[PDB]
């Protein structure tokens, strides 16, 4: 038999695999399939947090103009997260997707100025390039290595028209004077589900380099690399859709037989 | 909230015989 | 609708179809009680098998399964062999033969390749069947492509029978995948399912196989166009709306 341990593994797997904007529907399907409310909110608490960190969930805090992203990089513990731009911690309710309890948080450090410079350039980059995108930029001393991590999210949820979509990108610049190494992953997921279930899942990896100069110049060079790469990626996706529509899809099946008319089923059945 | 037409399409009407497992 | 099977089917509508097979497997693991009903209600990509006797390919799905064996439409035998596998009546087998032939021609005319299979089963006051079509690439081209057609028809004959009721539920699964330096990995996959029913005349000039063929052809032509709109129109527009 399937042990409860494999079961919880499954409920948690299903929840972490919910498409964008559909966490609640998936959670409630899994709730009803296990019929054990306290086991679920026990054995699956990790999955709720995992989902929101994987998805870069944006959240509005009462008191602050700027939304912030839930990511692994801002995990403060105890269901609390860092807002490095507004310089607060807040409580995040992973089930309700609700921010509460903002409290001032100390973000001062030697790297704050490089983080601030990258955050300023990035924020302008994001507002210009995404209809309602949000970004969060973190500064971490990781291997004694100073690292800037820029996370970008943009989603569009239209459940009433049976579709939801989300773009996430994650950009790591390890600030090792004189040549900083750049690593990114761009991801897209789109789900359409009127009378079916069609998804696009896409990702692209980026490797690059930039010369470390001043904070404001290094930031500008960082943003250029981001813009060029996110532009090429979007461009190429659309080129791929055209090619798929023009070639592969057309080859899988004809619109009609060579006669250019539907089948005469009498003639089929007669030989 | 979604319709599930594959639940109401014809089903096998002798008793199947499950796969392993 | 709050019912467990409706929840399970709802999950299948939301979970990534890129993992369609493991999703079903995990679901049956979570709710074994529903194993038979999910096996019957959850479409899975078709798998191709080889009939040694006739040297013809055939397709595997839940509908031609008994235990861990599948029945060929060409030879009418199970693989691996079974001692009392479920068999259509001698009568219904003959129609299944006519239907397989008819749908092998339909496949050639629309698909110019691939593989077809038709499997019929008796019902109390008629019969039912599935018409399956699989057309893939071999995986060597830049853009990988696979089409699964799963057409499930229910025929309820009247007291003559010079008229019958047909209910058709059709699923097409379409899978496209490419790895290009410009776009990174791109996997656009999934399925659409539509249902219709019609009363038709059954006569020698319009037999069951003719009526079913017309319904399958009409429905498949419509789903093809909808797939084109959703895959290459709607999802692309959503992508472009994100940035």
Residue numbers in the entry:
A (entry chain A): 7 to 277
B (entry chain C): 149 to 169
C (entry chain B): 2 to 244
Could you share sentences copied from the article?
The actin capping protein (CP) specifically binds to the barbed end of actin filaments with a high affinity and prevents the addition and loss of the monomers at this dynamic end. CP is a heterodimeric protein composed of α- and β-subunits and the molecule displays a pseudo two-fold symmetry due to the resemblance of the tertiary structures between the two subunits. CP caps the filament with its two independent actin binding sites at the C-terminus of each subunit (“tentacles”). V-1 and CARMIL proteins directly bind to CP and inhibit the filament capping activity of CP.
Since the CP-binding motif of the CARMIL proteins is sufficient for the interaction with CP, peptides derived from this motif were used for the crystallographic studies; mouse CARMIL (residues 985–1005; referred to as CA21), human CD2AP (485–507; CD23), and human CKIP-1 (148–70; CK23) (we collectively refer to these synthetic peptides derived from CARMIL proteins as CARMIL peptides). The consensus motif interacts with CP across the two domains: the N-terminus with the CP-L domain and the C-terminus with the CP-S domain. In the CP/CK23 complex, the C-terminal residue of the peptide, CK Arg169, forms an electrostatic interaction with CP (β) Asp30. Thus, CK23 appears to have CP binding affinity comparable to CD23. CD23 and CK23 moderately inhibited barbed end capping by CP, while CA21 was a poor inhibitor. Therefore, unlike V-1, the CARMIL peptides do not inhibit the barbed end capping activity of CP by steric hindrance.
